[PDB]
Amino acid sequence: KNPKSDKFKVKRFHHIEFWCGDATNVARRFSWGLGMRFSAKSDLSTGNMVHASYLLTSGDLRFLFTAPYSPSLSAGEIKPTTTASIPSFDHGSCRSFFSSHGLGVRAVAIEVEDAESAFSISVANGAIPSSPPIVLNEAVTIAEVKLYGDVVLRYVSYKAEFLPGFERVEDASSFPLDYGIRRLDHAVGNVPELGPALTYVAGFTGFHQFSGLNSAVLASNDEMVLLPINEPVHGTKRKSQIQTYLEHNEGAGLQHLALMSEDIFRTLREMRKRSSIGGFDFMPSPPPTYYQNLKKRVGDVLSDDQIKECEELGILVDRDDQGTLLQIFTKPLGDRPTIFIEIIQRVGCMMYQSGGCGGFGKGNFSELFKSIEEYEK
């Protein structure tokens, strides 16, 4: 059931912004690890005396990496005279965020029809304002409300190239890496209490509802903006990974980003080639029994060769009543056991493909448990 109750017109995920201590080194690591091209910058070389911001792109996926300069470079400026390209940026907020949480997502940005209306309607419906709507070069409007923890939901709307004040990067610096990643599929938050988090976010957006944790997914009208939220389940034998996250992150925050690949086998071949030379590591592969048991579960979707390819790369597979899900998880992206990345490809639900086709892989919890147990053998 989809009531289509969005309180304002939402289009697609637009970008994800990481707050960093040094944007250069994080961006370069991510570019090589994920096969994303450098495509825009806003920094000293573009007149920005406030923050260094570098944009990576792969297909429609946009990762922004931002770090503060010394406040002294901009101590003469005031907000009317600011050289910052992202007016919501604040030196103190950024340093407080990174010292508290370490490297992580500050903003989940969605493109909307009218960012000022989205902000006003959100706040009228309980959203905690973070940064009021600001019109950038009479062309782009940006506004921010609190989502969970110190993560904001960022609204962006365009009258008619990332943001004003960002320059496209020189093609010499812009090497066309591409491992097949094409768009953000979902962005997941960890909170202490799921109920109040859902009530808050669904309250101001109108988004509808789509071991160790309880979870639920909020979705926009066409279910292309997908925001799962997790809470820990206390008192289990194995301590909840959600609780470990909250402890190491100093509270609620973004847990994982799911990136859709147009060819998950190629993406994982390419990423795994680079794991030990600057890229990303992957969680331990499931035991061979998991792949033995995949014939009975998805034998009608993937051939024996395609499932063998999954076993090589450590891919996981799940299936709902509508489609099939291929997925795999990186180790944490930084020092702390907090944020990680999921690579995903979905099969089925063709009308274009409908959002969330195949679910989010919750069947893989019991199947992995069963798998290791019967693997022990």
DSSP 124-163: HTT--EEEEEEEETTTEEEEEEEEETTEEEEEEEE----S
Residues 39-58 that bind a second copy (CB under 8 A): 43-44, 52
Gap between the terminal Cα atoms of the chain: 42
CB count in 10 Å sphere of residue 338:
25
Which stretches within 15-110 are classed as H helix?
A: 23-34, 91-101
Residue 36 as a binder of a second copy (CB under 8 A): the answer is no
DSSP 228-272: EEEEE--S-SSPPHHHHHHHHHTS-EEEEEEEEES-HHHHHHHHH
* Contact code string over 347-376 relative to ligand X2T, x by CB under 6 A: -------------xxx-xx--x--------
Q: How many residues bind ligand X2T (CB under 6 A)?
A: 15
Residues 232-271 that bind ligand X2T (CB under 6 A): 256, 258
Structure tokens at 223: 């279910």
Asked whether residue 14 is marked as a ligand-binding residue, the answer is no
Angstrom distance (rounded) from CA 153 to CA 145: 5
Asked whether residue 186 is marked as a ligand-binding residue, the answer is yes
What does 322 interact with, of ligand X2T, Co ion, a second copy, none (CB < 5 to 8 A by kind)?
A: none
Q: Work out how close the CB of 364 gets to ligand X2T at its nearest, in angstroms, rounded to a whole number.
A: 4
Q: Are 143 and 118 in contact (CB under 8 A)?
A: yes
Looking at 146-154, 225-233, 271-279, 301-309, which segment touches a second copy (CB under 8 A)?
271-279
Structure tokens at 151: 């993560």
Residue 31 as a binder of a second copy (CB under 8 A): the answer is yes
Angstrom distance (rounded) from CA 139 to CA 136: 6
Looking at 15-23, 183-191, 219-227, 231-239, which segment touches a second copy (CB under 8 A)?
15-23
Question: Which one of residues 16, 40, 50, 67 is an interface residue with a second copy (CB under 8 A)?
Answer: 67
Residue 367 as a binder of Co ion (CB under 5 A): the answer is no
Q: Work out how close the CB of 255 gets to Co ion at its nearest, in angstroms, rounded to a whole number.
A: 9
Angstrom distance (rounded) from CA 336 to CA 252: 14
* Contact code string over 311-350 relative to ligand X2T, x by CB under 6 A: ------------------x------------x--------
Angstrom distance (rounded) from CA 282 to CA 313: 10
Residues at the contact surface with ligand X2T, assessed by CB under 6 A = 186, 188, 215, 217, 228, 256, 258, 329, 342, 360-362, 364-365, 368
In the annotated binding site for Fe cation, the residues are 186, 256, 342
Residues at the contact surface with Co ion, assessed by CB under 5 A = 258, 342, 360
